[PDB]
């Protein structure tokens, strides 16, 4: 904290305190009951046809092809990698 207007830790130096936890920022956390409901719904339903195709590609070990298919199906590569990780976990749990 240089206490200046330039540098890595610029700005006036005060007595920093611990902010209270914001309940809104808790969003995105997975609850036990929510996970249970989602697992039941996954059991009741199945997988989308694109999800099955991606799972088959992962089983065939065509990782790049599966990633490209997931990216095209879902849009952004970030969501593609998340879906790939989820489907890989499903496959290895089946194994």
């Amino acid at each position: 904290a240089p206490g200046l207007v330039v540098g890595l830790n610029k700005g006036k130096t005060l007595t920093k305190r611990q902010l209270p936890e914001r309940p809104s920022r808790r969003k995105g956390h997975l609850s036990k009951r929510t996970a249970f409901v989602r697992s039941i719904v996954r059991e009741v339903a199945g997988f989308a046809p694109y999800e099955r195709r991606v799972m088959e590609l992962i089983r065939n070990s065509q990782d790049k092809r599966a990633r490209k298919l997931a990216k095209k199906r879902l849009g952004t590569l970030k969501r593609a990698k998340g879906k790939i990780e989820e489907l890989t976990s499903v496959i290895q749990s089946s194994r």
């Binding site: 207007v5 330039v6 890595l8 610029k10 006036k12 005060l14 007595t15 305190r17 902010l19």
Partner: protein, 207 residues
């Protein structure tokens, strides 16, 4: 055509601007109407203060962070520190702002003292007349409408008149410090990346 001296014309009057002309011939009338409205509000809410107590906050830019202005409402942390519940604050005229937070003990204490001063100067009429409950005032006879800022105004930060010159101040090079800090702030990421890449390359060569 343009043949005269001066800057080139820039008039933005190529639309039907004459049908959207706003005159101000009602300015004295609006001023009188607003004054009458606030006088009526003062009479109807008497003896409660016309303007509610407001916190002191710092504006959020380097252009204005050296000043102090009035905020929207007191934070929950400030109300808890001052001993006022969020539900009772509205009843007694203390605004509550759930969005603002106290990142510094300076701002926390600054607003807490304001709430304490307001509570000390506040007269709370009993819910039932003649039966002062917890927090009620037993001397509500001398109650009158007063300006909140007349007893609790917003105060600006004071500057130091003078102080002795220190040897550290003598040896301090302000321009060199500014130049070094500016260069460091932009090249630190490159230096950190270089160190990480050097460590990775050295480990890979070792492998």
């Amino acid at each position: 055509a343009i043949h005269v001296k001066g800057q080139l014309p820039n008039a933005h009057f190529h639309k039907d601007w004459q049908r959207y002309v706003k005159t101000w011939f009602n300015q004295p009338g609006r001023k009188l109407r607003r004054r009458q409205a606030r006088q009526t509000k003062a009479a109807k809410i008497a003896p409660r203060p016309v303007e509610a107590i407001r916190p002191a906050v710092k504006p959020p830019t380097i252009r204005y962070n050296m000043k102090v202005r009035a905020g929207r409402g007191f934070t929950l942390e400030e109300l808890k520190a001052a001993g006022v519940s969020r539900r009772v604050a509205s009843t007694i005229g203390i605004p509550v702002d759930h969005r603002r937070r106290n990142r510094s003990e300076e701002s926390l204490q600054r607003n807490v003292e304001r709430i304490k001063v307001y509570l000390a100067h506040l007269i709370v009429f009993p819910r039932k007349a003649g039966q002062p409950k917890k927090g009620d005032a037993t001397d509500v006879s001398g109650a009158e409408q007063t300006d909140v800022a007349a007893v609790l105004p917003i105060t600006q930060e004071a500057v130091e008149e003078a102080k002795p010159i220190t040897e550290e101040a003598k040896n301090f090079n302000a321009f060199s410090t500014l130049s070094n800090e500016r260069a460091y702030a932009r090249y630190a990421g490159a230096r950190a990346a270089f160190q990480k890449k050097r460590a990775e390359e050295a480990e890979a060569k070792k492998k």
